[PDB]
DNA sequence: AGGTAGATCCGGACGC
DNA sequence: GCGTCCGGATCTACC
């Protein structure tokens, strides 16, 4: 899940949990719990708190409780559902928050990559994993100037730059490839090689792409669904991601796939320069 | 130096 | 049955 997927989950999850009071927290894979590292302390401190809100920072969900914030990263396969305490759990359910009304918030994660950190609300923003995060891309804090300031300093691939959460929050393998295609920039270009005009174009397309994907409920390419189990529709608007060997929608040249910045990387060798 | 590729955490889908 | 793939992202060897 990237920004648009996490945003859609946030929007669809909040009304199912707001105002509910935690009665128990059960943990079946303790490695998910990162702070407090002792999963018994993590569970104990959340009991008796009520869900007051649900925010997103980058790819993180921030559950606002009474005194605490719970910071959750779904990573590759993490997802939340709300269901009755009377039903058997689905496979790969690793954390369960039981509410006083007999419902439960269930965290499922086949690959177990997800993370959870709990801190007092006033501390969460100055501690990991939120502390290092770059600006929200749909905010004034992300501008071409902010992008150029990081780009000019490094010969790393522009893909590696955009995947770096300290540069800008929220972009992952899909939206990086898509933004670069739309901006006409090859993903292996050294960041410092981008012209002033290329940086402006890239910022514009990043903002447009993420915005569009939010409006479409995210991209369902393998396993992503919203909290109601509904697929997104942005996958029908992809120019390059997952389209290797198919014609470019713009020029008909076959889309190519390589590895860049350690990730599968999709591009049109004609439209991107 | 600082960028890149491999290893790691993890396990299911998929094609051959 | 067996590599390889995967909306994340660290660390660790290499130059
Ligand atoms: Zn093209």
From TrEMBL:
The keyword Repressor does not apply. Its cofactor is Zn(2+). It catalyses: 2'-deoxyribonucleotide-(2'-deoxyribose 5'-phosphate)-2'-deoxyribonucleotide-DNA = a 3'-end 2'-deoxyribonucleotide-(2,3-dehydro-2,3-deoxyribose 5'-phosphate)-DNA + a 5'-end 5'-phospho-2'-deoxyribonucleoside-DNA + H(+); Hydrolysis of DNA containing ring-opened 7-methylguanine residues, releasing 2,6-diamino-4-hydroxy-5-(N-methyl)formamidopyrimidine. GO terms for biological process: base-excision repair. PROSITE patterns: FPG_CAT, ZF_FPG_1, ZF_FPG_2. The active site is at residues 1, 59, 263. InterPro entries: DNA_glyclase_Znf_dom_DNA_BS, FPG_cat, FPG_Glyclase, FPG_N, H2TH_FPG, Ribosomal_uS13-like_H2TH, Znf_DNA_glyclase/AP_lyase, Znf_FPG/IleRS. Keywords: DNA damage, DNA repair, DNA-binding, Glycosidase, Hydrolase, Lyase, Metal-binding, Multifunctional enzyme, Zinc, Zinc-finger. Coiled coil: none annotated. Its EC number is 3.2.2.23, 4.2.99.18. Binds 1 zinc ion per subunit. DNA binds at residues 92, 111. GO terms for molecular function: 8-oxo-7,8-dihydroguanine DNA N-glycosylase activity; class I DNA-(apurinic or apyrimidinic site) endonuclease activity; damaged DNA binding; double-stranded DNA binding; zinc ion binding. Zn(2+) binds at residues 248, 251, 268, 271. SUPFAM superfamilies: Glucocorticoid receptor-like (DNA-binding domain), N-terminal domain of MutM-like DNA repair proteins, S13-like H2TH domain. Pfam families: Fapy_DNA_glyco (PF01149), H2TH (PF06831), zf-FPG_IleRS (PF06827). SMART domains: Fapy_DNA_glyco (SM00898), H2TH (SM01232). Residues 239-273 form the FPG-type domain. Residues 1-114 form the Formamidopyrimidine-DNA glycosylase catalytic domain. NCBIfam families: fpg, PRK01103.1. Monomer. Involved in base excision repair of DNA damaged by oxidation or by mutagenic agents. Acts as DNA glycosylase that recognizes and removes damaged bases. Has a preference for oxidized purines, such as 7,8-dihydro-8-oxoguanine (8-oxoG). Has AP (apurinic/apyrimidinic) lyase activity and introduces nicks in the DNA strand. Cleaves the DNA backbone by beta-delta elimination to generate a single-strand break at the site of the removed base with both 3'- and 5'-phosphates. Belongs to the FPG family. This is Formamidopyrimidine-DNA glycosylase.
């Amino acid at each position: 899940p990237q920004l648009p997927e996490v945003e859609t989950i946030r929007r669809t999850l909040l009304p199912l949990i707001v105002g509910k009071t935690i009665e128990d927290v059960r943990i079946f894979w303790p490695n998910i719990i990162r702070h407090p590292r002792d999963s018994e302390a993590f569970a104990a401190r959340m009991i008796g708190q009520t869900v007051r809100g649900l925010e997103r920072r980058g790819k993180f969900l921030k559950f606002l409780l009474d005194r605490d914030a719970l910071i959750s990263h779904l990573r590759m396969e993490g997802r939340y559902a709300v269901a009755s305490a009377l039903e058997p759990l689905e496979p790969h359910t690793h954390v369960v928050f039981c509410f006083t009304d007999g419902s439960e918030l269930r965290y499922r994660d086949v690959r177990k990559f997800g993370t959870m950190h709990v801190y007092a609300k006033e501390e969460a923003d100055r501690r990991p994993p939120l502390a290092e995060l770059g600006p929200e891309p749909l905010s004034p804090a992300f501008s071409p100037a902010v992008l150029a300031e990081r780009a000019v300093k490094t010969k790393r691939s522009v893909k590696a730059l955009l995947l770096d959460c300290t540069v800008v929050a929220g972009f992952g393998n899909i939206y990086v490839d898509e933004s670069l295609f739309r901006a006409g920039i090859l993903p292996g270009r050294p960041a410092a090689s981008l012209s002033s005009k290329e940086i402006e174009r890239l910022h514009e397309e990043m903002v447009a792409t993420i915005g569009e994907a939010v409006m479409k409920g995210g991209s369902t390419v393998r396993t992503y669904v919203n909290t109601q189990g509904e697929a997104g529709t942005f996958q029908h608007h992809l120019y390059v991601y997952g389209r290797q060997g198919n014609p470019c929608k713009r020029c008909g040249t076959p889309i190519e796939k390589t590895v860049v910045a350690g990730r599968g990387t999709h591009y049109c060798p004609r439209c991107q320069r």
